Design a protein around this ligand. Structure first.
Ligand SMILES: Nc1ncnc2c1ncn2[C@@H]1O[C@H](COP(=O)(O)OP(=O)(O)OP(=O)(O)O)[C@@H](O)[C@H]1O
Length: 570
């Protein structure tokens, strides 16, 4: 649109005449100039508005400098869905019968623009179109939703704090951000407190049952039941799940941006089982996408997913989900593009009344450090094909040097990706503790040493992050692979220590003739095998992990001699 307004139609005649554009444009027409929206809107007709001026309105309220037609379509579709929920609620009639809820609808549209800023506004030289992430989940995500079945709403992701001029402003939790001055009138605030709206709630100090009730209301689930409670449900995860649900229930394609460390599959499975509750039908459908996947199997799997989608919907009245993990490593990433962006599989249209939501993932596009590139090229014999002559690149850089071998994400997906988070390590250690308490089975193993195990796991993870390069971003993937290693080492830690003492007695002096913990030595083995085995700067790791170790192995020499002794034992 930005490059047609000057020289000149532009809008689709059948789409302007559609409600998905007429309703947002009608509301924007009434709101651009200042009129009370108490009048009855959405006549189920076509207003005397022009497609050109409609495009002008959506441009001046889209904010981003150079929007494609896809981004305008996303904005308008999202805004239409949200205003449809607003009209479906009895709050317009609530204001009519209250006669003092004035200023409610201007706040409604302003907050709509805010959450649209959230949703339909994203944004090395060749990685610049991809790695340049202006907004992360470490940003304000003000969210409001209208719960269909009942008459209670949910205001998540922000706070309402009394302003100095008598008003109430949007203050984000855990810090001070004073965005959106003068958004509402105090009569709306009074009517809201008359309506007992759950506004300005810090969800970090609310019970699991109550937060699940808040979700089920927000997720529109009636008679909620709690399917899983072994996963911590923080505020940011709530923001993510509501973001996904809004995205795929309004119509926006939902591509997921994040690294392997972040928990994405777990969260979507959580959402799917919350939607399902107790039916035995297969709702979530994981698809493992990898660097040998060709379009035939993706097309076939999507077809079978839509088949099982009819199966679920027609005779269960349920909504299912199909998921793709790291759906970027395939040379057929664009196949995922036509699957999800324009709703067409292998040239065949995907039915909106079938009942199915497609969610795909993506890896972050970032080049390795030159230090580990030297490490790789020096791994004995160098690579067969050098970088200048590698055919499978994305730009001027081979996939061999990237942190994930990921091909160029096609356009019309860049305006769609949105990051889940970097796993800031504030909740990393808690998840590690949960894993090490769930899968170690330490009912009677070590009442307090489990804290030490989790802490040294987090310390090693921080060592991995506190270094310019990493193997493959094995964050929260090597820990859930090494808890099992630790459990195995403890399970056989009985004859191992006996053989250790025998070997050290029959082949060494009295220095290695001391008792060792069945756990701490097992911890030394787990760190030696999962983490200390791979990296080539082992001295630094030995000196930077000896801190979290207790008295027997306070230094690097102790850890090294223990690992070497066990290798010699085997
Ligand atoms: N002039 C227009 N007026 C209204 N909507 C438009 C206009 N042009 C495009 N759109 C909207 O843009 C959306 C995306 O466009 P479309 O799928 O044709 O993109 P594309 O350029 O073919 O995609 P890609 O290059 O990613 O394959 C369509 O669903 C359509 O509704």
């Amino acid at each position: 649109p930005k490059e047609v307004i000057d020289m000149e139609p532009a809008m689709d005649p059948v789409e302007f005449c559609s409600e998905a554009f007429q309703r947002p444009y009608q509301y924007l027409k009434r709101f651009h100039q200042q009129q009370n929206l108490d009048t009855f809107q959405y006549e189920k007709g076509s207003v005397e508005g022009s497609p050109e001026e409609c495009l002008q309105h959506f441009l001046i309220y889209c904010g981003l400098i150079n929007p494609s037609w896809s981004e305008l379509r996303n904005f308008a579709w999202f805004l239409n869905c949200q205003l449809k929920d607003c009209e479906a609620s009895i709050f317009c009639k609530s204001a009519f019968t209250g006669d003092t809820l004035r200023g409610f609808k201007n706040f409604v549209v302003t907050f709509m623009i805010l959450m649209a800023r959230d949703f339909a506004t994203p944004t090395e030289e060749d990685l610049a179109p991809f790695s340049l992430r202006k907004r992360w989940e470490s940003e304000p995500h003000p969210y409001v939703f209208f719960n269909g079945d009942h008459m209670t709403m949910t205001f998540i992701g922000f706070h309402l704090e009394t302003n100095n001029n008598g008003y109430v402003d949007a203050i984000n939790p855990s810090n001070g951000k004073v965005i959106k001055k003068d958004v509402m009138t105090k009569e709306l605030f009074d009517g809201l407190r008359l309506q007992r709206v759950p506004f300005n709630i810090d969800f970090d100090n609310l019970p699991r049952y109550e937060k699940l009730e808040r979700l089920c209301l927000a997720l529109g689930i009636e008679w909620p039941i709690d399917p899983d409670e072994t996963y911590e449900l923080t505020t940011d995860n709530m923001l993510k799940i509501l973001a996904i649900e809004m995205r795929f229930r309004c119509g926006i394609p939902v591509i997921i941006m994040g690294e392997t460390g972040c928990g994405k599959t777990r969260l979507i499975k959580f959402l799917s089982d919350l939607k399902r509750g107790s039916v035995e039908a297969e709702t979530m459908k994981l698809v493992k996408v990898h660097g040998g996947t060709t379009p035939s199997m993706i097309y076939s799997k999507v077809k079978e997913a839509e088949r099982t989608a009819f199966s679920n919907k027609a005779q269960h009245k349920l909504d299912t989900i199909l998921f793709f993990d790291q759906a970027n490593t395939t040379e057929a990433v664009s196949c995922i593009k036509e699957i999800l962006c324009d709703r067409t599989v292998d040239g065949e249209h995907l039915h909106e009344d079938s009942g199915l939501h497609i969610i795909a993932a993506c890896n972050p596009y970032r080049k390795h450090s030159q230090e580990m590139i030297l490490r790789l090229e020096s791994a004995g014999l160098g690579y067969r094909v050098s970088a200048e002559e590698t055919a499978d690149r994305l730009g001027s850089i081979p996939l061999r040097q990237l942190v994930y071998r990921v091909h160029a994400l096609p356009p019309s997906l860049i305006p769609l990706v949105w990051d889940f988070g970097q796993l800031n390590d504030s909740a990393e250690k808690l998840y590690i503790q949960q894993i090490v308490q769930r899968l170690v089975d330490s009912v009677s193993v070590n009442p307090s040493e489990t804290c030490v195990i989790a802490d040294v796991l987090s310390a090693s993870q921080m060592f991995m992050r506190k270094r310019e390069n990493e193997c493959g971003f094995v964050s929260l993937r090597d820990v859930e692979r090494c808890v099992k290693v630790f459990r195995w080492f403890h399970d056989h830690s009985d004859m191992l220590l006996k053989e250790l003492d025998k070997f050290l007695h029959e082949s060494s002096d009295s220095t290695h003739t001391f008792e060792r913990d069945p756990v701490l030595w097992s911890l030394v083995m787990a760190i030696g095998v999962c983490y200390h085995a791979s990296l080539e700067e082992k001295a630094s790791y030995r000196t930077a992990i000896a801190r979290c170790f207790p008295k027997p192995y306070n230094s690097s020499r102790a850890i090294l001699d223990e690992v070497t002794h066990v290798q010699d034992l085997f």
